[PDB]
Amino acid sequence: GLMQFTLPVRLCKEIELFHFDIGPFENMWPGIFVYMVHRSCGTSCFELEKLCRFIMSVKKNYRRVPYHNWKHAVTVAHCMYAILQNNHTLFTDLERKGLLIACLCHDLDHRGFSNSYLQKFDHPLAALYSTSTMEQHHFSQTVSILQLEGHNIFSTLSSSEYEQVLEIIRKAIIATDLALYFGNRKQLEEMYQTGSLNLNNQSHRDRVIGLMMTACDLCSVTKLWPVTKLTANDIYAEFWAEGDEMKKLGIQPIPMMDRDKKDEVPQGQLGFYNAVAIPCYTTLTQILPPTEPLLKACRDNLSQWEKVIRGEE
């Protein structure tokens, strides 16, 4: 009950900032996550013993892929931690509990391939789930781990509170399917501009939580340039392997995934920043003004990719 997690001074200060990097020491990431739950939620949200057993079963079920790994899970949870702490009074007790868990679990048992590669491979998961294939799998794995003995971190909630939080987690994890992001942000745009955005409309909250999840999931584009640049190598290492596996099926992959077209990467980044990331953090900053540092950092990194193209690095 009286057992706080405390971090070293540099981490204690830097963890509050959006651009915080969780660092290369794997063994500190569980402590970082717990620290965040305790300040985001309270020392009493979760029985520590159950939380710790949950965190380690979740860690065990992330695979050793270059990008979609345990480190990505904790990075995405940290961004959500920053958004929740800069928007203290906007979110329910259940939402604060559910969203940090949703983020930690959002890519459970990812294999480093897109939904598209499962569909063309004809992977069994693509028969079981026709859309948001990996994301429905991630939620399924979350429910599995919650049902291991000693792993029910929500055991003290009522029957209806438990169903509310598992429903927040399901919507939150489905929303990380970027195919769904485009329409979700367009609707949030229209709603904000016509002035119909109402945070007491559950269907509006759902949409706003969906955009937060896209924002946290993409948060590698909002780090200081050297973090963003080095993470892009991990991302492209998965993409090029997928490209390779497409060619193995007799399918020319999109250039973003073709390792023979590495030259085209910097222009592809611009595309991605302009088509996906900037629109995402723009709309998020309109709905949640204190999340502006994410937009500013995203713009700084767009400018750094422009410099890569212009030969200036």
Residues in contact with ligand IZT by the rule CB under 6 A: 114, 178-179, 218, 220-221, 232, 235, 256, 269, 272
Of the pair 38, 234, the CB lying nearest Mg ion is at 234
Distance from C-alpha of 235 to C-alpha of 220, rounded to nearest angstrom: 10
Our answer to whether residue 68 is catalytic in this structure is yes
CB 106 to Mg ion: min, Å: 6
Q: According to the binding rule CB under 5 A, does residue 107 interact with Zn ion? A: yes
Q: According to the binding rule CB under 5 A, does residue 176 interact with Mg ion? A: yes
272 makes contact, choosing from Zn ion, ligand IZT, Mg ion, none, with CB < 5 to 8 Å by partner type, with ligand IZT
CB 231 to Zn ion: min, Å: 12
Q: Does 164 show up as a binding residue in the annotation?
A: no
HSE, side-chain direction, 13 A CA sphere, residue 222: 29
Q: CA nearest 104: which of 156, 172, 154, 43?
A: 172
Distance from C-alpha of 200 to C-alpha of 187, rounded to nearest angstrom: 17
Alpha-carbon distance values, 229 to 14, 37, 129, 264 (Å): 20, 29, 34, 15
Distance from C-alpha of 309 to C-alpha of 313, rounded to nearest angstrom: 8
Q: Does 258 show up as a binding residue in the annotation?
A: no
Of the pair 217, 234, the CB lying nearest Zn ion is at 217
Q: Does 72 show up as a binding residue in the annotation?
A: yes
Q: According to the binding rule CB under 5 A, does residue 238 interact with Mg ion? A: no
Distance from C-alpha of 276 to C-alpha of 304, rounded to nearest angstrom: 17
69 makes contact, choosing from ligand IZT, Zn ion, Mg ion, none, with CB < 5 to 8 Å by partner type, with none
Handedness of CA 148, 149, 151, 156 (dihedral sign): positive
How many residues form the binding site for Zn ion (CB under 5 A)?
2
Q: Which of 95, 217, 234, 242 binds Zn ion (CB under 5 A)?
A: 217
12 makes contact, choosing from Zn ion, ligand IZT, Mg ion, none, with CB < 5 to 8 Å by partner type, with none
Which residues, 6 or more positions from 205, have their beta carbon under 8 angstroms from its beta carbon?
95, 199
On whether the CB atoms of residues 257 and 242 are closer than 8 A, the answer is yes
Residues 115-144 that bind Mg ion (CB under 5 A): none
Angle at 91 between CA 87 and CA 95, to 5 degrees: 125
**Can you say which residues are annotated as belonging to the binding site for a divalent metal cation?**
72, 106-107, 217
The residues that are catalytic are 68
Interface contacts to Mg ion, rule CB under 5 A: 107, 176
